[PDB]
Design a protein around this ligand. Structure first.
Ligand SMILES: *Cc1c(COP(=O)(O)O)cnc(C)c1O
Ligand SMILES: *Cc1c(COP(=O)(O)O)cnc(C)c1O
Lengths: 384, 384
């Protein structure tokens, strides 16, 4: 009876040939092969960016981007309080302080007015996250950016192929980061990228250097110019990503027609409020199918999730307020207290307990499974 | 005329099948597949360790090992002054100070007496590096370790499959790290590992947690316990490593018979002193075929290297004193000066300018190419 959904990840002969091609180059790191090099140009073109830097994972893409944008001891990074922990963790790994800021009640995106107030003389970077593939308010955020002189960094891990006001992630005037971890919209099990808009070639060069043990690509005498790490992506991963990229736009198009349906079936459910839209985000990538059931405690929400999993749905609890994780308080925490932070992040505080999400693979299924999915949900929500 | 050597890396159907097997699992990260899990047990068994943690690269394996061993702001890490920059860089990325210490004149391994003197009340970790596959003096180093109470961390990136006093890397009583970067003794283009001896399960658990965004393997509600990063290895990389592991011992055995020959042809060259041995290291992995030409400046050495490359040899300049790199001085540097450091690292200071190395692939070639290789070298060294 249980509605079945398409598998994720997906692959076919493109992946197969790709892995063979990478293998048969006889050189499996980016300095001897061409898959990473080629994936970078394809990825960057696809997002209209001037440059793309493929890296080990989306967590290190944030760490490297914050580092070339000056994050470090003595700085503050503004991040939405409702996101995946990597968004703060990356700043905190650099010695910076993470200042969590509230998000919109409807889109769950970083609230522009809340950021204007957290802005401080220490603020080095403001970091919107495009929640579930729906871009954040890059117009209002860019104004704040202009007025404070605090650059923006897009955490675009959920927004492969997304668009704001007809513009691509890489055509806003900010650096952005992506993840290619197994459950993301294109994947090689692990992987990430830093994409640089027009105008940021110097930061792009510095990032290359910092991601390769600070060694020039054709240094022969071990001349390390600057500190850093190794965040290089391997040729096999790159080749699977080149095949994944090629199906992305059509997968985002199937998902957009399905969200239109499911969003409306969800909103017809008593107590259920699906993520809101925004007409300015002309292209939503649909990384997650998210909805709130306002008023639920965390325990009722988790119990509703468990019941949804028992009926065959790939449903999950949404992120937790980052300030409600122990990891957040281990290092570089703000001098406010937990309730002081929660006081001024009321939407996060409720969304942290309220919100449910379905795997984006559900948005590739046919309409009838969407119908079956929303009945399963309607029943369960009456009993939550 | 130019002697030809076997290719590196090497692969065959094992790699091919492996990549397909990984692909066909349909899940490409360690939480949904079994290649990383399986590579970890195989790798750990092969080194007699209790546990193995496969990670993105050998640089992050050092960073993660130093972090679970307490490295951080306020500590000092003792490392050989002649090594790859990652060895210090990792400590310096953690906020610690790197204290470079001299190495043996003959083996180029961390000098046990030099470390006893650099030892300080701040010293958190002493880090031998098994230069070119030849283990460092783990007996004398373990005594210093016992007397100071400063734990050892083996940087075993050059020492896959190596042995000290009949014991495997993982059977000494220390954590060790490896690299699987393209030119290493087994590779997937990129990759690394942390191996834990018997007795270190708690550090092994902490390291797992720190390498996966501080999230328990089957957390469902985003409970991040501790800070860290993402240093997870992907299933395709793991599967190529499982096939590489299986040829390692026989490749180390061919190399050992060839070094015996080449070492003696080299030592018969006027001015040429090949890396020395050590009978206590019963199994040398032979990552590099190294030799010094005492008295050469860096420029004569580099010119001799260029001439050796022009005759068809995969010859390189050896590492540079870490204290002679700009990267070293960018962060967490000691309060000594450059000449103060060089004063008390005289062997490094000369080896940094003196030493030449050939790719370990040369040690898989037949004897006749070793003979041709040593004539090419004899000629070039007379003219250096
Ligand atoms: C997945 C994710 C990341 C980090 O990516 P990894 O590839 O998993 O390290 C960063 N930010 C957001 C919002 C994410 O969802
Ligand atoms: C290669 C190397 C490393 C680091 O490894 P990557 O996989 O290249 O990051 C660490 N230490 C030594 C001595 C090495 O040679």
């Amino acid at each position: 009876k249980a509605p079945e959904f398409p598998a994720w990840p997906q692959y076919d002969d493109a992946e197969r040939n790709g892995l063979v091609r990478a293998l048969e180059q006889g050189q499996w790191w980016r300095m001897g092969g061409d898959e990473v090099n080629s994936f970078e140009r394809e990825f960057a073109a696809h997002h209209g960016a001037a440059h793309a830097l493929a890296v080990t994972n989306g967590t290190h893409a944030l760490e490297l981007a914050l580092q070339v944008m000056g994050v470090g001891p003595g700085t503050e990074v503004i991040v939405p309080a409702f996101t995946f922990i990597s968004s703060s963790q990356a700043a905190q790994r650099l010695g910076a302080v993470t200042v969590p800021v509230d998000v919109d009640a409807a889109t769950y995106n970083l609230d522009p007015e809340a950021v204007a107030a957290a802005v401080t003389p220490r603020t080095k970077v403001i970091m919107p996250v495009h929640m579930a593939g729906l871009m954040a308010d890059m117009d209002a955020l860019a104004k704040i950016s202009a007025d404070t002189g605090v650059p923006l960094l897009q955490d675009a891990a959920h927004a492969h192929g997304a668009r704001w006001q007809g513009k691509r992630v890489g055509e806003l005037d900010s650096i952005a980061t992506f993840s290619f971890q197994n459950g993301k919209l294109m994947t090689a099990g692990e992987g990430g990228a830093v994409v640089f808009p027009d105008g940021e070639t110097e930061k792009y060069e510095t990032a290359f250097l910092r991601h390769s043990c600070g060694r020039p690509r054709d240094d022969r005498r071990y001349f390390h110019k600057i500190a850093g790490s190794n965040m290089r992506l391997n040729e096999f991963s790159a080749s699977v990503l080149r095949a994944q990229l090629a199906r992305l736009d059509e997968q985002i198009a199937v998902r957009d027609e399905r969200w239109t349906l499911l969003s409306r079936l969800l909103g017809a459910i008593d107590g259920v409020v699906p993520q809101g839209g925004d007409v300015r985000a002309d292209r939503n990538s649909h990384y997650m199918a998210m909805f709130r059931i306002p008023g639920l405690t965390e325990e009722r929400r988790n119990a509703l999730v468990d019941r949804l999993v028992e009926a065959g749905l790939p449903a999950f609890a949404a992120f937790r307020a980052i300030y409600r994780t122990d990891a957040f308080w281990e290092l570089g925490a703000p001098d406010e207290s937990v309730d002081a932070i929660a006081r001024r992040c009321p939407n996060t505080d409720a969304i942290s307990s309220d919100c449910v999400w379905l795997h984006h693979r559900v948005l590739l299924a046919g309409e009838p499974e969407l119908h079956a999915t929303a009945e399963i949900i309607a029943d369960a929500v009456a009993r939550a």
